[PDB]
Write a protein that binds this ligand. Sequence first.
Ligand SMILES: *C(=O)CCCCCCCCCCCCC
Ligand SMILES: *C(=O)CCCCCCCCCCCCC
Ligand SMILES: *C(=O)CCCCCCCCCCCCC
Ligand SMILES: *C(=O)CCCCCCCCCCCCC
Ligand SMILES: *C(=O)CCCCCCCCCCCCC
Ligand SMILES: *C(=O)CCCCCCCCCCCCC
Ligand SMILES: [Cl-]
Ligand SMILES: [Cl-]
Ligand SMILES: [Zn+2]
Ligand SMILES: [Zn+2]
Lengths: 29, 29, 29, 29, 29, 29, 21, 21, 21, 21, 21, 21
Amino acid sequence: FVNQHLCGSHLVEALYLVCGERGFFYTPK
Amino acid sequence: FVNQHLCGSHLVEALYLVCGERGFFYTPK
Amino acid sequence: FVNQHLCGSHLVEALYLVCGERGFFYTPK
Amino acid sequence: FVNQHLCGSHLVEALYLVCGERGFFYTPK
Amino acid sequence: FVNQHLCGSHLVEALYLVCGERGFFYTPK
Amino acid sequence: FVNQHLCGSHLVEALYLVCGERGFFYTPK
Amino acid sequence: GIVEQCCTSICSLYQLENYCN
Amino acid sequence: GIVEQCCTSICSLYQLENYCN
Amino acid sequence: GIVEQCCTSICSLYQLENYCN
Amino acid sequence: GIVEQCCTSICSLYQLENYCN
Amino acid sequence: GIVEQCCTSICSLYQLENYCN
Amino acid sequence: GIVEQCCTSICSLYQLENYCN
Ligand SMILES: *C(=O)CCCCCCCCCCCCC
Ligand SMILES: *C(=O)CCCCCCCCCCCCC
Ligand SMILES: *C(=O)CCCCCCCCCCCCC
Ligand SMILES: *C(=O)CCCCCCCCCCCCC
Ligand SMILES: *C(=O)CCCCCCCCCCCCC
Ligand SMILES: *C(=O)CCCCCCCCCCCCC
Ligand SMILES: [Cl-]
Ligand SMILES: [Cl-]
Ligand SMILES: [Zn+2]
Ligand SMILES: [Zn+2]
């Protein structure tokens, strides 16, 4: 599915900003 | 260094597209 | 239409990454 | 030079918005 | 709502490019 | 300076995510 | 506002200019 | 996961913080 | 074209390579 | 201005909050 | 080329128009 | 680390693959 891919594309950018030095693990559905 | 932050914001999207279902981990520190 | 415009916005970025030095031609529908 | 890659990733989106239905060509080399 | 958030995410980038030195005010619905 | 333009394009998305319903103003000059 | 118009129809460069300071 | 929650409802900054290391 | 295919189904890296010069 | 504060030094999320309406 | 003109000097929107099909 | 390898030198797509889960 495509629109989920689009939201995840913006989701990782939002996580990168919010977390910062801590980082994050991105696991999709 | 802000330039580091900018490339990191490009690295997360590069990992997102490359990994896909596997997922990625972003650990600068 | 708008959501196609959104997907094309991410599509050109994905093409830019994947192609690299070769480049690409982007022709919409 | 990574900075070149970053601006190129901004150039593709600038061409995408500007050209629209016409389309664009990205040829660094 | 999410897809409106996605379009606004691309909308601010489009406004930033088009306006330039003038700038803009972004007020959502 | 193009590097200024690149970070500004990252600043607008940072303001967009942070402000949300409140909105933001981008005034370099 | 900007969301109501340009997120329902594609906005031309002049329409985006209307939102500039 | 992150996709199931934040791609169906808008996630607040604290909810995004829950995914940080 | 690229919009008709990759915006209706997820395109794999080889499919994106098909659009490269 | 925002250009002289948040782009010559890395701004934390709160430093981005100051320019919100 | 576009890399030698629009990325070593800031290109206005019209300078981006030159590379459109 | 990824910051010390892929951002001080341009990383090809495969060099991005190394940080996948
Ligand atoms: C991966 O396969 C995604 C799993 C989540 C299901 C997505 C669809 C859920 C219902 C949405 C229907 C709206 C689209 C017509
Ligand atoms: C340009 O005019 C786009 C041409 C492709 C048609 C888009 C719509 C196809 C069917 C989608 C319906 C879903 C939206 C309600
Ligand atoms: C904020 O609450 C958004 C206000 C605009 C309403 C969005 C929905 C309008 C009709 C769209 C239905 C399509 C989604 C199923
Ligand atoms: C209008 O031009 C804004 C006035 C301040 C501009 C400062 C530009 C400084 C040059 C860039 C230095 C940092 C590079 C990442
Ligand atoms: C292929 O490599 C393109 C040939 C021209 C490349 C010029 C690179 C100049 C180095 C970057 C200078 C500006 C940094 C923002
Ligand atoms: C945490 O801060 C990561 C440790 C390594 C940081 C290296 C930063 C180097 C400065 C930037 C050089 C390249 C600019 C594009
Ligand atoms: Cl989208
Ligand atoms: Cl950048
Ligand atoms: Zn999007
Ligand atoms: Zn950038």
